Amino acid sequence: EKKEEEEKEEEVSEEEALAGLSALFG
Amino acid sequence: KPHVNIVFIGHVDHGKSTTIGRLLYDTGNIPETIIKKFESFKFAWVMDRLKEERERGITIDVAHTKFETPHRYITIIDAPGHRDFVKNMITGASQADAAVLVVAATDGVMPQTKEHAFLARTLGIKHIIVTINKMDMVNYDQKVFEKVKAQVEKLLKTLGYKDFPVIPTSAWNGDNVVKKSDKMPWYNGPTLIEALDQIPEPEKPIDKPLRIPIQDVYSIKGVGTVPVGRVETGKLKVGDVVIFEPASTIFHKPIQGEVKSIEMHHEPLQEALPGDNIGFNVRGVSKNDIKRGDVAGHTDKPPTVVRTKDTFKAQIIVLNHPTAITVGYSPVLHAHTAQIPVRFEQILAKVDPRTGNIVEENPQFIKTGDSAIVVLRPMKPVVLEPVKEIPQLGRFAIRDMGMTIAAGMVISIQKG
Numbered sequence: 001e002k003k004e005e006e007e008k009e010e011e012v013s014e015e016e017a018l019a020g021l022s023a024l025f026g
Numbered sequence: 027k028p029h030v031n032i033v034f035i036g037h038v039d040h041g042k043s044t045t046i047g048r049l050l051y052d053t054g055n056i057p058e059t060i061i062k063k064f065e066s067f068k069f070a071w072v073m074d075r076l077k078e079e080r081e082r083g084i085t086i087d088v089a090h091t092k093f094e095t096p097h098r099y100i101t102i103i104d105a106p107g108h109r110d111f112v113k114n115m116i117t118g119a120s121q122a123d124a125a126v127l128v129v130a131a132t133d134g135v136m137p138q139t140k141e142h143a144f145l146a147r148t149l150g151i152k153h154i155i156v157t158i159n160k161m162d163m164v165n166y167d168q169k170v171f172e173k174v175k176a177q178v179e180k181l182l183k184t185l186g187y188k189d190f191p192v193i194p195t196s197a198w199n200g201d202n203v204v205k206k207s208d209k210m211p212w213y214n215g216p217t218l219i220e221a222l223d224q225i226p227e228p229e230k231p232i233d234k235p236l237r238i239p240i241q242d243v244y245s246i247k248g249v250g251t252v253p254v255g256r257v258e259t260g261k262l263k264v265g266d267v268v269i270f271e272p273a274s275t276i277f278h279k280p281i282q283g284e285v286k287s288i289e290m291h292h293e294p295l296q297e298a299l300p301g302d303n304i305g306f307n308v309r310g311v312s313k314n315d316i317k318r319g320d321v322a323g324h325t326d327k328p329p330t331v332v333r334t335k336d337t338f339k340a341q342i343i344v345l346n347h348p349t350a351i352t353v354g355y356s357p358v359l360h361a362h363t364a365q366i367p368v369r370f371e372q373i374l375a376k377v378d379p380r381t382g383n384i385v386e387e388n389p390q391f392i393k394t395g396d397s398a399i400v401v402l403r404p405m406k407p408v409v410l411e412p413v414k415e416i417p418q419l420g421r422f423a424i425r426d427m428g429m430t431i432a433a434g435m436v437i438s439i440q441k442g
């Protein structure tokens with residue numbers, strides 16, 4: 001279940017990346 | 027039949043070339059050089075020959091391959107993977123009606139997938155068609171399709187698109203590219219070629235708000251002030267009230283008046299249309315109040331002004347500056363009829379000229395050949411519009427020391 005936490009963390013990181021793109025192209 | 031231009035986007039290896047190839051192959055629109063090469067004819071051999079043409083230096087922009095559908099003429103005008111990809115999109119040499127965004131079923135949406143989607147929104151491409159490719163490599167499974175579709179929906183909705191098709195394809199075997207698949211009964215939407223057939227005609231310049239960049243201004247004895255310029259968008263009528271920017275902003279009062287008369291080739295008109303080179307007599311406007319580089323619009327939707335206390339954000343391609351460009355660079359920006367000094371305030375991202383992928387956030391410097399996202403402050407007020415809204419007023423060149431440093435397109439304006 002450490003694996004589940006890591007998947008979520010990585011998923012959120014990718015959402016943060018999307019937000020960085022929204023800011024860059026905003 | 028209306029003509030429509032398309033671009034292919036998506037992560038390297040997700041299947042852009044293969045999908046184009048499959049479109050060409052299954053419609054029999056094989057390039058002539060390949061037909062001659064041939065003089066066994068399987069899809070795989072054709073892909074090899076399209077690849078070989080690419081390696082000989084025939085790039086998609088140059089090949090500008092075309093096919094016909096029942097309601098369209100379709101030109102494939104560009105795709106990432108060649109030296110001038112970003113330059114063509116920025117300069118407007120390649121203008122796309124739609125983007126086909128290819129996402130592999132095996133990998134899902136990747137960081138570069140999202141970057142190309144942003145590039146598409148930035149350019150003003152209103153119509154997206156997503157393919158979820160390599161369906162054959164995931165056993166034509168609906169669940170896999172549905173999981174990637176949800177990723178894609180989440181990305182494109184965040185960007186502001188809506189109701190784009192999402193089509194499961196195998197460019198390699200052909201499923202849902204031109205021929206309806208028999209391996210995916212669970213899908214009932216359009217094939218890629220059907221979705222291409224339904225790309226709507228582009229919004230007409232006449233339907234955008236009026237913009238007339240002023241080239242020159244006359245003051246004729248017993249007639250008054252007569253600016254001269256080209257109608258870029260919208261339409262101008264005798265009787266209309268027009269306002270001039272940045273004249274109005276600089277003077278802190280409306281520089282505006284009623285159009286007494288219009289003329290092209292020294293002959294009277296009652297209305298001017300996009301592309302017309304006109305003179306127009308405006309009452310109540312003094313010769314001194316307007317000048318080259320002003321822009322006229324209706325009072326309804328006045329031309330957007332970037333003041334010295336504002337910034338704007340642009341994507342550029344560096345054409346000629348072999349030494350480092352760094353924050354504080356202060357060349358001259360030329361757009362429509364204006365020229366103003368501009369300062370580079372931030373370089374937010376360095377961008378791969380071949381693909382439109384981001385190379386680096388907040389780079390220290392850029393050079394010839396780099397693309398970049400930049401924040402610029404005008405040192406005198408200037409009319410600019412985001413290219414995605416009014417492209418005719420969204421592109422510009424940067425000049426310094428007699429030469430052309432860069433070409434750019436306006437992303438957004440920051441009111442300061």
Ligand SMILES: Nc1nc2c(ncn2[C@@H]2O[C@H](COP(=O)(O)OP(=O)(O)O)[C@@H](O)[C@H]2O)c(=O)[nH]1
Pocket residue numbers: 036037038039040041042043044045128159160161162163195196197198199
């Ligand atoms: N099995 C399978 N392979 C594919 C498909 N689409 C592309 N490929 C293969 O994947 C690799 C990359 O495809 P390509 O069209 O070059 O991707 P691009 O880099 O996006 O243009 C090539 O080796 C293709 O043969 C597909 O639908 N199914």
